[PDB]
Design a protein around this ligand. Structure first.
Ligand SMILES: Cc1cc2nc3c(=O)[nH]c(=O)nc-3n(C[C@H](O)[C@H](O)[C@H](O)COP(=O)(O)OP(=O)(O)OC[C@H]3O[C@@H](n4cnc5c(N)ncnc54)[C@H](O)[C@@H]3O)c2cc1C
Length: 510
């Protein structure tokens, strides 16, 4: 028996454990398949792995001593450092004693008679708890790509999601499949280290510089001395990325001024910065979206000296969502040991013992093939497990037509279960979202313990009304199963209205 069981020991699960155990004095256990804390920052050890938000914001804000104590080494934070930070959090707040590592949860069945969750590990261990905190998503299990004969490759075959240790690159011909955010990081990191790099791009995307530089002692002090305000700005923003979020229309200024504004964001770096600090309507106005793209296309044509290679790199879609971020990606393609294959025009048809073969019949001889096809679904990690709520219905079935929730945290027919960083949540920097949700969920659970209620469930009406809110907002924009896209501040307003009005939309049963 526990008051709560938590699944996941990443950002989400760790803070859930801290809040529920230490601030609400609940008896709680957390579980993870991993051998240590860190979540996706434990699993993803691929070359070039790097946060998308700046170091000083990609962290917890609730421990002020930790803010002052923590190293701010570079403007953005590498995977090994995020892992060390989360391990430090675990150290300081004595969290590991309440985490069971190497423990996959196979199933969670809700008991309506006793108003609690039956949780079964993959080693057939059974636990009971009133509440189930799911801090799971969304890192997809290493699915090898569906390519004929992939199993016959005798060289190294690595998936970015399970990057083994001790990989060396020198003297080797290497191929990478995928040019999403993960592929860009790996490609940029390894190109100078391999004998030859072949990039298999199915779909080109725009990338802007991340502009990751070392932070001076003076840079760090500016942040640490003003940390309270820096966080107040996060809570009062849409993205929580530390940006001066623009309301200026792209076409309201001259062509010369517009170039100047894009150029300033380009020099500073950051994907959301280029899209949201420059102007206020890039994700909304077609003309404005095209202007932004043309700025990046022009950069591609300038950096990549071979116009034919520049062309292949240039996305062909009419409108573009957020760009990726890089630390020298387009530069790579000027190298004599790098080949770009457009495998939309010239697809992979087979993989043989020593090569990737494209539809033109060319045998791309490889010593190593890397799958950076980090391809998933937002509710993938919920669907993967056997979760059953009311009348025994599975989450797989309830979401067969797609993930729907109330406030991104509650699923109708699944009482006493609360999602952290689940589907239909806000579009923003993750750790502020996760803090926002963990604190809301805990206050609700605390409310329940204080009013002697043992069953909390979102009504179908609240769920569909959340679906509606998301839809009305989302369809204002060009892009694009909806996130809530009103921003962090408004998401915080939405959930506050719920908690401030007796948790309307929630069935509270004594
Ligand atoms: C390289 C990289 C950079 C990123 N940068 C940013 C960024 O800058 N800003 C941002 O907002 N987001 C970023 N992300 C996205 C990232 O996923 C989130 O920031 C964050 O890691 C989510 O934390 P989480 O605790 O909710 O989930 P995770 O960190 O993924 O941890 C989930 C854990 O739950 C465990 N788990 C799940 N299911 C089960 C089960 N059935 N049994 C047992 N155990 C289980 C998993 O093993 C996993 O350890 C980045 C991702 C990557 C790969």
């Amino acid at each position: 028996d526990f008051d709560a069981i938590i699944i996941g020991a990443g950002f989400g699960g760790l803070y859930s454990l801290k809040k529920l155990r230490d601030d609400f004095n609940l008896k709680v256990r957390a579980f993870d398949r991993a051998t240590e804390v860190g979540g996706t920052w434990f699993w993803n050890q691929y070359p070039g792995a790097l946060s998308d938000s700046e170091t000083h914001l990609y962290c917890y804000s609730w421990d002020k001593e930790l803010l002052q104590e923590m190293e701010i080494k570079r403007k953005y934070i590498s995977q090994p450092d995020v892992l060390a930070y989360l391990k430090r959090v675990a150290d300081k707040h004595d969290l590991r004693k309440d985490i069971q590592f190497e423990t996959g949860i196979r199933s969670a069945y809700f008991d309506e008679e006793n108003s609690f969750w039956n949780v079964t590990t993959e080693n057939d261990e059974k636990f009971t708890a009133r509440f189930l905190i799911t801090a799971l998503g969304l890192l997809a299990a290493p699915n090898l790509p569906k390519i004929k004969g992939i199993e016959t490759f005798k060289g190294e075959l690595h998936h970015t999601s399970r990057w083994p240790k001790d990989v060396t690159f020198s003297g080797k011909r290497v191929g990478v499949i995928g040019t999403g955010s993960t592929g860009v990081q790996v490609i940029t990191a390894i190109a100078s280290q391999v004998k030859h790099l072949t990039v298999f791009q199915r779909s080109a995307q725009y990338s802007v510089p991340i502009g990751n530089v070392v932070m001076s002692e003076t840079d760090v002090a500016k942040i640490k001395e003003n940390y309270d305000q820096i966080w107040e700005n996060v809570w009062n923003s849409a993205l929580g990325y530390g940006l001066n979020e623009s309301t200026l229309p792209t076409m309201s200024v001259s062509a010369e001024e517009r170039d100047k504004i894009f150029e300033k964001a380009w020099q500073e770096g950051g994907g959301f910065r280029f899209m949201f600090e420059t102007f206020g309507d890039i994700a909304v106005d077609e003309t404005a979206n095209i202007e932004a793209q043309n700025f990046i296309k022009k950069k591609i044509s300038e950096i990549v000296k071979d116009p034919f290679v520049a062309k292949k790199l240039t996305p062909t879609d009419l409108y573009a969502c957020r760009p990726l971020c890089d630390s020298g990606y387009y530069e790579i393609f000027n190298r004599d040991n790098v080949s770009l294959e457009d495998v939309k025009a010239n697809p992979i048809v087979e993989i043989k013992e020593d090569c990737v073969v494209t539809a033109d019949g060319v045998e791309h001889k490889l010593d190593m093939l890397i799958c950076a096809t980090g391809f998933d679904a937002v509710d993938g990690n919920y669907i993967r497990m056997d979760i059953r709520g009311k009348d025994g219905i599975s989450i797989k079935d309830h979401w067969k037509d797609g993930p729907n929730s109330y406030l991104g945290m509650m699923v109708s027919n699944f009482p006493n279960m609360f999602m952290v960083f689940g589907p239909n949540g806000p579009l923003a920097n993750s750790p502020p979202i996760i803090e926002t949700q963990v604190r809301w969920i805990a206050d609700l659970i605390g409310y329940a313990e204080d009013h002697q209620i043992n069953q909390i469930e979102a009504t179908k009406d609240a769920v569909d009304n959340w679906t509606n809110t998301c839809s009305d907002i989302a369809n204002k924009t060009l892009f694009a199963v909806y996130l809530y896209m009103g921003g962090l501040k408004e998401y915080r307003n939405q959930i506050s209205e719920v908690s401030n009005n007796n948790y309307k939309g929630c069935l509270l049963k004594q």
